[PDB]
Amino acid sequence: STGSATTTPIDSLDDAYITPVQIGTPAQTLNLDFDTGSSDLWVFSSETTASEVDGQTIYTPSKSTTAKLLSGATWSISYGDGSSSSGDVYTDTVSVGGLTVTGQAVESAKKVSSSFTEDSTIDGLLGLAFSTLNTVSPTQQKTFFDNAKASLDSPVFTADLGYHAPGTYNFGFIDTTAYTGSITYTAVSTKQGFWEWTSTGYAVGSGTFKSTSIDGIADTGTTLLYLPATVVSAYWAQVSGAKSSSSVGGYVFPCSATLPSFTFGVGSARIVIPGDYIDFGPISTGSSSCFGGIQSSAGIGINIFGDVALKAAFVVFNGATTPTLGFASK
Numbered sequence: 001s002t003g004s005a006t007t008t009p010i011d012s013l014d015d016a017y018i019t020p021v022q023i024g025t026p027a028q029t030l031n032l033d034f035d036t037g038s039s040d041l042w043v044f045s046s047e048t049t050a051s052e053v054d055g056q057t058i059y060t061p062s063k064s065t066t067a068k069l070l071s072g073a074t075w076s077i078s079y080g081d082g083s084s085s086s087g088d089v090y091t092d093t094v095s096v097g098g099l100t101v102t103g104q105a106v107e108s109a110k111k112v113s114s115s116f117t118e119d120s121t122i123d124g125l126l127g128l129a130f131s132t133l134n135t136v137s138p139t140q141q142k143t144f145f146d147n148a149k150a151s152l153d154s155p156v157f158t159a160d161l162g163y164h165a166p167g168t169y170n171f172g173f174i175d176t177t178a179y180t181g182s183i184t185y186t187a188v189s190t191k192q193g194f195w196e197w198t199s200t201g202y203a204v205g206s207g208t209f210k211s212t213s214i215d216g217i218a219d220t221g222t223t224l225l226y227l228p229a230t231v232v233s234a235y236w237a238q239v240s241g242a243k244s245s246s247s248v249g250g251y252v253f254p255c256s257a258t259l260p261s262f263t264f265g266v267g268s269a270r271i272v273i274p275g276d277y278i279d280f281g282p283i284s285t286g287s288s289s290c291f292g293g294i295q296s297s298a299g300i301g302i303n304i305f306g307d308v309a310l311k312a313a314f315v316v317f318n319g320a321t322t323p324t325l326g327f328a329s330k
Helices: 144-151 229-236
Strands: 003-009 017-023 028-035 041-043 068-078 084-096 099-112 124-127 156-160 167-171 184-187 196-204 210-218 225-227 243-245 250-254 262-266 269-273 279-282 289-292 294-296 303-305 314-318 324-328
Touching (some): 099 144
Parallel strands (some): 210 303, 225 294
Antiparallel strands (some): 003 167, 017 028, 184 324, 250 289, 262 269, 279 289
């Protein structure tokens, strides 16, 4: 089997991407944030505290003939950005782009933090990291990908995120028309439960490539590119007037600037992030200070190849017995 679904930015900045997901019988379609940095599939639901729902579409398990309460199971998750959610668990039929999993754990939110409430466009998350990170207790549950894997034509999914445009998540096949050149594969460590890999270095604009190992995670659920302070300083030093602002919470730059590209290494291959991808617009409405898309990972504890980086590539998440990651230009 295979699946193919379009993923769409939630706003003009590509702050996140939503992908329609069919849950239950008859289908209830919710728009979920596919997150290769976490491993829970959770949804706004009929159980979510009323005051914490503001415009989201909810899953109502009582209206699904295939829903079953997973007795005694609870979940609770905290994300890198400080947001969180928790609740109980159903199993139900879940389909993405024509690919169907029966008996998928669907984690129903009883509580969500303010940032989830305040984002009316995201109806929940669909985790695509390794199932070892799944938070369901007392019996850990499998991700949608883990459940689908055996049935897939090939044990892979791909992320093809658009810049200010829709893109695609495919399951079970590699669309050879979706990228240019060849796909360069690189080793993955699953020791922390992430799609963790080591970039071979970077360049800023038309500058020379610096060969240096940068360990980090491929994380579709993180907006920006978070890298070591040395790398980030080298980038922003090429933008007149750019500076790190503790009050704003990172590097800002004059909105009048033309940003240089940023290149990262994948083995001997190179992925180029155009400068425009690094512009996250005014810090507040009407400001001439703009927020940067490359930020320091210092104090996160991990480097994160988030959407800014991933949307510059066609990315293969290869879930074979020994997982690997592939990157192609597009």
